[PDB]
Amino acid sequence: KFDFITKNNLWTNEQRDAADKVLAEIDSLGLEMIRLSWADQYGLLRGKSLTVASLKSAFKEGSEVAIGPFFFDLVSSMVFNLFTFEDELSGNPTVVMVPDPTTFKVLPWADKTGWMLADLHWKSGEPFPLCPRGIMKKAVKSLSDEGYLFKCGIELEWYLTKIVDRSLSPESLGAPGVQPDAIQVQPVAQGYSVLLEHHLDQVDDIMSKVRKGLLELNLPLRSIEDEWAPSQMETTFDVMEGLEAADAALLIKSAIKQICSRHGYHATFMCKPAINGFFASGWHMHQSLVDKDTRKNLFIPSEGEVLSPLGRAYAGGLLANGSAASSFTTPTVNGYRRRQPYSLAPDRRAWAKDNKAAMVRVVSATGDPASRIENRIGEPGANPYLYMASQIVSGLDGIKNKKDPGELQESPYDAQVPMLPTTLAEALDALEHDSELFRSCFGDTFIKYWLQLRRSEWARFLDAEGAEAAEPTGAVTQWEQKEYFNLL
Amino acid sequence: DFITKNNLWTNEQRDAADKVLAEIDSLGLEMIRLSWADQYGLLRGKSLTVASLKSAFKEGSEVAIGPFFFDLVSSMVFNLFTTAFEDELSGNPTVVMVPDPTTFKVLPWADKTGWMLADLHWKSGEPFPLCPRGIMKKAVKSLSDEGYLFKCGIELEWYLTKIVDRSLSPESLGAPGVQPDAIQVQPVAQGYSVLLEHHLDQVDDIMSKVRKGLLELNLPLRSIEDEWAPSQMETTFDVMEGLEAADAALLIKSAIKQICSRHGYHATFMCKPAINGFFASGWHMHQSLVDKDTRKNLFIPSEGEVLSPLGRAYAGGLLANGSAASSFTTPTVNGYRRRQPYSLAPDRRAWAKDNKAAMVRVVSATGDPASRIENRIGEPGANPYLYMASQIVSGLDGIKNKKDPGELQESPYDAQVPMLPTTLAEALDALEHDSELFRSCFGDTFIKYWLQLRRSEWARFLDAEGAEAAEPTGAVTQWEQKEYFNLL
Ligand SMILES: Nc1ncnc2c1ncn2[C@@H]1O[C@H](COP(=O)(O)OP(=O)(O)NP(=O)(O)O)[C@@H](O)[C@H]1O
Ligand SMILES: Nc1ncnc2c1ncn2[C@@H]1O[C@H](COP(=O)(O)OP(=O)(O)NP(=O)(O)O)[C@@H](O)[C@H]1O
Ligand SMILES: [Mg+2]
Ligand SMILES: [Mg+2]
Ligand SMILES: [Mn+2]
Ligand SMILES: [Mn+2]
Ligand SMILES: [Mn+2]
Ligand SMILES: [Mn+2]
């Protein structure tokens, strides 16, 4: 068989050793299938399930796939002509999924099934420019080149509901460009009784299975918590690093959804479902930089500081680029329901010490290795690679250009600072009008592609619900429910 | 190491932490709940993994004070958005849950789950002033400084019902400041045949599970009894001491509710549910003081006495402060349904020997170490910490000022003594106009906070049902059912 991986130098020695160990574990465990997957532009896992023999072949030749998913939106509108590359963004070329053996997992909820991520490459051997994991890799290398590792604490809010109807009737299936029916669900608990232990116990018949699945995947689960709204959950994780953290967040969301569905439940990372009483869910990103060699947290402040100078410049970069990065931290139309004051979610580019109204909330103390920046702007349905890469790119831009975050705001909701985009369209406008950094770091081809795609989605939303409905405080529309509830 | 830096663990607590970690590993536990009682006595907190708990044994676990500024339906009674603290009572600072390893339990009804209480501290290291367990700690220390230990017999009445509908439909979930629907239930047995053995047998398929859970928690279960009303139960426990006794009462109520819910039943400590035929439930507090060194009961009477002089003065303090303490022993609007005569509940500040019509009932015999005071004023839904601490503070005040209870009442419902508050508002007035003692021991800030919070709750009740509805002999309102039935 042709060895595409060796010829194109796509595996490190570490990856090759891991490939040997992975095959040994597959044999020892008697696995029958190994999923080969990769995140699309929305963070959703696409790929194939291979047999053992086919995976062994893929460890030399890769596995061919079409780029179709990149040119579809969530309902398979054809945004880019698959029938008619970086210049025109058209066609259906074949790319090669090259497995990343360091990502291998055994999926506990499935029958004799393993799981692995793949990187997309042209048959020429070059990375596919639209691959979001590749964009995270570029961000990680840019940060390594400067002496730093990205340390990230994953804090995810989500909704846990019980399935009433999976909406499988032919009349509910939609069509290309036509949303299918949302799954029908029922809340699993009452709410507005935050952090209530009895809520944790009431849902633990299924939540214990979620917990066990996450632990058995060797994910660093830290806490399970009862959030404010009915059936709203929160799961946090211990600190992870760079690509691993992004891969982990991706797998975490996938595992929660799959386990829940296996038992007749529906988990969703849709920011604010159209269900009475459901409040918006957030994805706050906890971030620190550590020295590649000394492994010390370089954000730790001395006395009379809230952050080290380096951390202060990182925060400056987060603030300065918060509008341009908005479509990456907050990619869904529905995620902008959180862009309003008095929400404990951010409406403006302000930093503050421990104040949960700020976009950038600093949590720190002299000599404390937990000292960190929390960016509260993200939504749970964000693509982990694009979210984390936007954070790295913004913070590194702040360090290189010595950006100043300005004064810590005591009342962030009164701060005389730039407002954040209130709609996805505003976020795309902000990116278009301030595109240089993300063109340079994510790639010009990717930014062109991203703008075109997301704008087509906004146009669909506008056509279905009208401009008035985009107001963040307005009720969640049926378009949002039928776009995001089932898949995110 | 926040705990070591602030000297927050005794050497016994550190030894206990070692043992707790060893037991967690030996049993293969996967989750450990870290909880604390809020102002209503409800358990709030997080569920942590083994790794996260090990970290919390050094740095504690951060949590927001949100629950203290919410009422039972999450009315925002204090402004979480304006950064203040003890003068302003506003804001949303982060505090540190410091685990108390001496409280560790394995929860028998849950999957591989341990459980622990936590004390709330500012990040400066000082105790958080609104924390009710801390108020109990201060009462216990105040009592110890005088040479005494608090011995308490826990006697809880409650209702056992079978769930018909958990009221989980979106239209039933309420909203912040808006009560959700009560759970719908069915009685499990007829009543008005008190202490009937056949009733005990009829309910023992579920009551046996409650019994086993309490026994496996190593709680000193003493009796299970058929109380007067249909489906009304009573569970008593052998004598416990001080802070343990309060912690145990908290765990007892939580365990009863969780076991019952796990099996499709609803236990409630709501005083008098809006269910036809349900009579009011009480929490009589059996109390004695023991000498810290001799370990002897200092209430034991001589011949021609019903209590030693010390016990008689303690009783005097209980009576003298009974109106000011009313919101603590009887914090619920619904609990004042018991403030009426000919009820076997107290309507006045009278004491008597073995008369169940009195507030302070003496049970004693010459030289009998069971000699004690039973205060019949409390309701089952009381916060264990606030109820017990109010008792300690009142009795110690009686001792210090040599307060005289007056003459024993042969007919308490005809006694020439001050009447007890008949509404929560009256109880808050009594505390406000006579606050010095409870300000001195519970703290000014807590008393200011308590008054403001409970008055907002009374205002909600008044607006929903009118003043006319507060008359104790009136029917239980839907507001009471939708405020207390689900959570208490
Ligand atoms: N140095 C660090 N760098 C990055 N993340 C860190 C660091 N130290 C701690 N974390 C992470 O920070 C997160 C803490 O989140 P959590 O305990 O939910 O509190 P919070 O996010 O500060 N508050 P909240 O919005 O109110 O829920 C965890 O994911 C930790 O692993
Ligand atoms: N010295 C003591 N100090 C405190 N509590 C004690 C003491 N001796 C016994 N007790 C407790 O007193 C309680 C007695 O409760 P119980 O047997 O129900 O009595 P009762 O007063 O007759 N109740 P009731 O008939 O329902 O009104 C138990 O919780 C005992 O553990
Ligand atoms: Mg959190
Ligand atoms: Mg009794
Ligand atoms: Mn949260
Ligand atoms: Mn957070
Ligand atoms: Mn009784
Ligand atoms: Mn009694």
Numbering used by the authors:
A (entry chain A): 4 to 87, 92 to 495
B (entry chain E): 6 to 89, 92 to 495
Study authors write:
In view of the above analyses, NpaA1 was established as a γ-glutamylnaphthylamide synthase catalyzing ligation of 1NA and L-glutamate to form γ-glutamylated 1NA. The crystal structure of apo-NpaA1 and two complexes with substrates or substrate analogs were obtained. The binding pocket is located at the interface between adjacent subunits, and the bifunnel channel similar to GS protein refers to a structural feature characterized by two distinct channels that converge into the common active site.
When the ATP analog AMPPNP binds to NpaA1, an additional Mg2+ binds to the active site, facilitating the binding of the AMPPNP phosphate group.
